[PDB]
Amino acid sequence: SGFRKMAFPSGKVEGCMVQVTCGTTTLNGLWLDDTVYCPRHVICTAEDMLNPNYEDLLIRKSNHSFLVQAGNVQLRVIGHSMQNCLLRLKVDTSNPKTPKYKFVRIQPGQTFSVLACYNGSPSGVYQCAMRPNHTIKGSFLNGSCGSVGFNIDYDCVSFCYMHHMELPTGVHAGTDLEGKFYGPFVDRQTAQAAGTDTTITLNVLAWLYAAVINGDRWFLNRFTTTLNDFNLVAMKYNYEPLTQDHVDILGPLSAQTGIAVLDMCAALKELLQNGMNGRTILGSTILEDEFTPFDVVRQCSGVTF
């Protein structure tokens, strides 16, 4: 029993983190096979951060402009290229600890684990959700750029995020491992702001199912609702509209608990209109939206209590 925000074990990723230095700028890189991936802004200086021309900045560099360190070992770069907002540095040694892996672009609402790193050295691991506004609410300080996000399936690491920047609201933005940003953001220090965010409805419902699987039913009720009537209430409380696809995704959790999706929607509508009345759900006094249906199935018992 119990329910916690849980990260994936980070071992397979720790063995891929390295340090990349260019001039006076140091940040993290990801070392897979004979390639090191890192944010392209490693080549920037303080003066040119407002409006850098990366093509022009990169053509001026050589292979020896980049210092790559794995632990105490120097890796000589033998080639380099730019891919969107990343640099790909070819190195002379293939990482012996390269796990089975792939690169995935995750969708808003989905979750992943972040390995926060400084100077190529891992400091911590935590779970994050990609917000509807394409930011994440992380914990990142100076030097954290190049830290990666990932999920694990069997022995395959799906990398989905590399960290680049912090916005004025304290939230974080970055790219997939092909260097394409999540959201409309750009890697320059021109004024940018996160769009307005929304609560991830599908995840709140998943988490309500988790609470029932763990033995708690207090928030259920005898009512039901239509999709449309639910969505009127969702719009009022800044929740994402629920779609039939979302209803279908909740099928397995619905089957395991015997609670119809639209009945759980009625329960959520009631929680939104009346509040929680000083009660808790899975230890929380608020409605949690950073657990996906898949997170719930992974962590919870296959048998309800």
Ligand X SMILES: *[C@](O)(C(=O)NC(C)C)[C@H](C[C@@H]1CCNC1=O)NC(=O)[C@H](CC(C)C)NC(=O)[C@H](Cc1ccc(F)cc1)NC(=O)OCc1ccccc1
Among 138, 146, 149, 179, the residue binding its own copies under the rule CB under 8 A is: 138
- Catalytic annotation, pick one of 145, 160, 265, 300: 145
156 is catalytic: no
The reply to whether 251 sits near its own copies by the rule CB under 8 A is no
In the complex with ligand X, the residue whose CB is nearer, 54 or 230, is 54
- Burial (CB count <10 Å: 0-12, 13-18, 19+), residue 25: middle
Q: Dihedral (C-alpha) 66, 70, 76, 80: value to the nearest 10 degrees? A: -50
Whole-Å CA distances, 117 to 121, 123, 284, 290: 5, 5, 29, 22
β-strands 156-166, 100-103 pairing: parallel
The reply to whether 37 sits near ligand X by the rule CB under 6 A is no
d(CA 171, CA 185): 12
The reply to whether 99 sits near its own copies by the rule CB under 8 A is no
Stretch that binds ligand X, among 103-111, 122-130, 139-147, 281-289 (CB under 6 A): 139-147
CA angle 106, 114, 51 (to 5 degrees): 75
Among 49, 78, 232, 255, the residue binding ligand X under the rule CB under 6 A is: 49
Among 10, 144, 201, 231, the residue binding ligand X under the rule CB under 6 A is: 144
Q: How many CB atoms lie within 10 A of CB 30?
A: 25
The reply to whether 143 sits near ligand X by the rule CB under 6 A is yes
The reply to whether 191 sits near ligand X by the rule CB under 6 A is yes
Among 84, 139, 221, 273, the residue binding its own copies under the rule CB under 8 A is: 139
Beta carbons within 8 Å of 19's beta carbon, 6+ residues apart: 26, 27, 28, 29, 68, 69, 70, 119, 120, 121
Q: Tokens 């400084």 belong to which residue?
A: 118
d(CA 196, CA 245): 24
Binding positions for its own copies, 261-290, rule CB under 8 A: 283, 285-286
- Smallest gap, in angstroms, from Cβ of residue 115 to its own copies? 7
Which residues here bind its own copies, judged by CB under 8 A?
A: 1-11, 14-15, 115-116, 122-126, 137-142, 166, 170-172, 214-215, 283, 285-286, 298-299, 301
Which residues here bind ligand X, judged by CB under 6 A?
A: 1, 25-27, 41, 44, 49, 140-145, 164-168, 172, 187-192
